[PDB]
Design a protein around this ligand. Structure first.
Ligand SMILES: Nc1ncnc2c1ncn2[C@@H]1O[C@H](COP(=O)(O)CP(=O)(O)OC[C@H]2O[C@H](O)[C@H](O)[C@@H]2O)[C@@H](O)[C@H]1O
Ligand SMILES: [Cl-]
Ligand SMILES: [Mg+2]
Ligand SMILES: [Mg+2]
Ligand SMILES: [Mg+2]
Lengths: 205, 202
């Protein structure tokens, strides 16, 4: 038979038992309660543990990058939840969209690039996929870098709710360091780009 | 860059839809459009769970990182395993500073006594559906003493500590073996600033 998969952690998916899932509140996004038992590091089985989980979904995130002009296209839009801990709820972000049945991360990213920023992506490349806050939410965001021509930017579909900004990669990175760009998807994407722009520029050359 | 501020948004109401360990709130508001007019009323369901203090344990002398392992059941449906490799992290309670929480949780979750500490970055995990803000700090630790299982008994935290070189942790992030936001952000930051940090502390 097959050998088991290698894991970087101690226990795998088979070492936990999801006893039950109950909806605590059902709205656009449901807040659920998971009842489960899992192996402890000391070898013993746990009691039943209960956790409230915000079932948010799965998102596609696209970093529009122009390797020739070394620029990034950012979108400005309001994220009301940022109101209580930010100076302004209008954030500079990446192209993004929720992924539904039968859709791929790439399909959503390309479609969002057109709807939100009026950009037509060329080559795309998988970057990273992260869990926004796994202690309380199931959300998972997959990031891809999209090859674009920043000339075609700076009139898009959602132009009254979304404003497009074309800036140098270095300017964008600087804003992250200064804390002027602080939403997870953007920070991760821009740090990744700052760590890999040369190779990506040569790859797409 | 951004020009619209809080005066460009009219929060009509914030209602509590659900209140348990965490709360679920509804925001009813109007916000200005990029054509200058005000939007119709908009509703958004927001997950309110407080704010977090995150600590990246870094040994400048050995160039190693201390990671903690623990199960996060919310990762079950989209991950290969619910047990994640993460940074020390705690919920900031009533009037506690990011530093107090980060240093306290480091003892609690990993039994590490952090020496010098430095702020890193503060981010919003997902401004679209949650108000959560996580503030990351890097803490100087002696990795040769980091070990074993920890976590608070009364909270029922079962946490195991792992010590790996900084390069490995960074490669695991680019490889998707560490993929929770706080850890990814903290480790890419470390990879971008490790030489300057070693120079300062080592
Ligand atoms: N889903 C939940 N429902 C009910 N009780 C819960 C839930 N999550 C955690 N708790 C309770 O809080 C303790 C964790 O305390 P912190 O240690 O004080 C906090 P920590 O878990 O670490 O969260 C900090 C950051 O790490 C994760 O990524 C989170 O998303 C967050 O951004 C757990 O032992 C448990 O008792
Ligand atoms: Cl498997
Ligand atoms: Mg914790
Ligand atoms: Mg705590
Ligand atoms: Mg804790």
């Amino acid at each position: 038979m097959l050998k088991p998969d290698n894991l970087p952690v101690t226990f795998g998916k088979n070492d936990v038992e999801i006893i039950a899932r109950e909806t605590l509140y059902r709205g656009f996004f449901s807040l659920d309660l998971y009842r489960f038992r899992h192996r402890l590091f000391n070898g013993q089985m746990s009691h039943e543990v209960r956790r409230e989980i915000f079932e948010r979904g799965h998102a596609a995130v696209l970093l529009p990058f122009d390797p020739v002009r070394d620029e990034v296209v950012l979108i400005e839009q309001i994220r009301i939840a940022a109101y209580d801990t930010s100076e302004t709820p209008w954030l500079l972000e990446m192209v993004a969209g929720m992924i539904e049945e039968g859709e791929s991360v790439e399909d959503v990213a390309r479609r969002e690039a057109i709807e939100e920023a009026g950009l037509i992506v060329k080559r795309t490349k998988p970057v990273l996929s992260f869990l926004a806050s796994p202690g309380g939410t199931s959300e998972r965001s997959s990031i891809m870098v999209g090859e674009v021509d920043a000339t075609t930017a700076s009139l898009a579909d959602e132009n009254e709710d979304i404003r497009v900004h074309v800036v140098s990669r270095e300017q964008a990175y600087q804003w992250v360091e200064e804390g002027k760009i602080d939403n997870a998807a953007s920070v991760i994407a821009l740090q990744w780009l700052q760590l890999h722009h040369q190779a990506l520029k040569n790859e797409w050359a």
